[PDB]
Design a protein around this ligand. Structure first.
Ligand code: K
Length: 216
């Protein structure tokens, strides 16, 4: 949701630095295309939300991912088709998506460097963070970095005061060190946006399920 802090910048050099694994997701269901975001976290693996993968209606092939998409049909790393989805077992709106190599035989986390996950030991309320992904109020498949502060950390949940819009589902939340601290899921109008906070349990889930995920 859009919040009083609406500080968003378009990333056009989407493959530079930490932005490269930020990924644009289209779930191409016959009923329509669900747009979302995600972050590549391993050679074959990206994180996004449960509600994003639910949009596949059980067909993981419906989920297409375009790391570092710059804009509409402008996908410097091509696209990848999901093959296996593992939802987080906890409440958090988090899902792991693994991709097959694409039709160019490349891997989603070889065409871009997977994100580095934070161990979140130093993450705290009031820290400046960004949530970077693919808001649906911007033009198709454009990446935007939205800036704000953590406002709430509780368990496996975080909230923040920065703005996002549908399309951002699954966007990585980055700290200042450009580590992923959480995975945005959405928000509550006029109140906050929120992410799954990658605390010890969620890190454990991720490490159990993604062999090459990198925590700092
Ligand atoms: K391969």
């Amino acid at each position: 949701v859009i919040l009083p802090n609406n500080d968003r910048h378009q990333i056009t050099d989407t493959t530079n630095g930490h932005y490269a694994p930020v990924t644009y997701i289209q779930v191409e269901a016959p009923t329509g295309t669900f747009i979302a975001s995600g972050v590549v976290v391993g050679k074959d693996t990206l994180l996004t939300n449960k509600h994003v993968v639910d949009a596949t209606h059980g067909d993981p092939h419906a989920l297409k991912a375009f790391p570092s998409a710059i804009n509409q049909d402008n996908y410097p790393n091509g696209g990848f088709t999901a093959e296996q989805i593992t939802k987080y077992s906890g409440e958090g709106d988090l899902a792991i998506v693994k991709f097959s190599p694409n039709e160019q035989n490349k891997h989603i986390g070889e065409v871009v460097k997977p994100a580095t996950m934070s161990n979140n030991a130093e993450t705290q309320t009031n820290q400046n963070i960004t949530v970077t992904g693919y808001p649906g109020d911007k033009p198709v498949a454009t990446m935007w970095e939205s800036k704000g502060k953590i406002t709430y950390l509780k368990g496996e949940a975080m909230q923040y005061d920065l703005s996002t819009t549908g399309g951002n589902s699954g966007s990585p939340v980055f700290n200042e060190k450009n580590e992923v601290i959480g995975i945005h899921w959405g928000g509550v109008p006029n109140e906050f946006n929120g992410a799954v906070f990658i605390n010890e349990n969620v890190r454990n889930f991720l490490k159990q399920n993604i062999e090459d995920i990198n925590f700092a």
